[PDB]
Design a protein around this ligand. Structure first.
Ligand code: NA
Ligand code: NI
Ligand code: NI
Lengths: 121, 120
C-alpha cells in the first residue's frame, strides 16, 4: 500500500456543493470509517442532508457556520463538531476565504466490514 | 451529548514530545477510533514509536518531514499519511512555524468496543 497521498487540490470532486477529496478508496487501507477533506468555497454553502451514519467534522482552516437542525454553530480552526444521527446539516461560508474541514463518518456496517476484511486477510 | 467542542489552544497536553488535544473522552460520543489534534513546535521532533494499531495522519498546517522506518516523506497541508503497522514513526519540524496534524488510530479492540457500546 501507498503510505502517502499528496494532496492534489485540482483533483477534488465537487459534491454536496463543496469540493472534496475522499479518503477511500485507498488500496491496502482498511478502516472502519470513511473520510473526506472538504472545502466550502468563499461565499458559498454546502448541500443540506441527513443520515443514519455517525459523522465528525474536524475544522481545519477558515470560518463558517455549521447549521444543524436550524441551530447555528460558528466554527473555526481546531473546533470539533459531532453531527447528530439523522440531523439535517450543512455548512455556510459567508467569508472571503476557503473553509476547510475533514469529515469522518462511520456506522455498524462500516465497522463490521473492517473486521470482516481483517479476518479475510 | 455536547455537539461542539471549541478548541482551547491554552489547554493542550504535552505528550509524545508534541502538544496535543485528544478527541476522547467525549461524553456521548461513540467512535470505533481515537484521535488527536497535534502540534509539533518549531525546530523540534516528536517521540518515535511503533504499535500494532492502525493510524493515519491528516496534515493541517505547516511543513514537516515524516520519517517512517528509514524513509523520509516531506509533507504539507492536505497530505495524508498511513502509518504501517509496527513501523517506527515520528514527525520532524525544521521550520519556524508550528506543524499541525490530526491523527486517527484504530484496531480490532476499538472497533469491537464501538459495536458493544452500541448494543448496550
Ligand atoms: Na487559501
Ligand atoms: Ni453528513
Ligand atoms: Ni503512532
Amino acid at each position: 500500500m501507498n503510505i502517502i497521498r499528496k494532496m492534489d487540490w485540482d483533483s477534488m470532486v465537487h459534491e454536496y456543493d463543496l469540493d472534496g477529496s475522499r479518503l477511500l478508496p485507498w488500496e491496502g487501507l482498511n478502516t472502519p470509517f470513511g473520510g473526506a477533506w472538504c472545502i466550502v468555497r468563499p461565499e458559498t454553502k454546502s448541500f443540506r442532508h441527513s443520515h443514519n451514519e455517525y459523522e465528525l467534522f474536524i475544522v481545519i482552516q477558515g470560518n463558517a457556520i455549521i447549521r444543524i437542525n436550524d441551530e447555528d454553530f460558528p466554527v473555526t480552526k481546531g473546533d470539533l463538531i459531532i453531527i447528530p444521527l439523522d440531523s439535517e446539516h450543512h455548512v455556510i461560508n459567508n467569508n472571503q476565504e476557503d473553509f476547510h474541514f475533514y469529515t469522518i463518518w462511520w456506522d455498524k456496517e462500516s465497522t463490521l466490514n473492517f473486521l470482516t476484511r481483517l479476518e479475510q486477510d
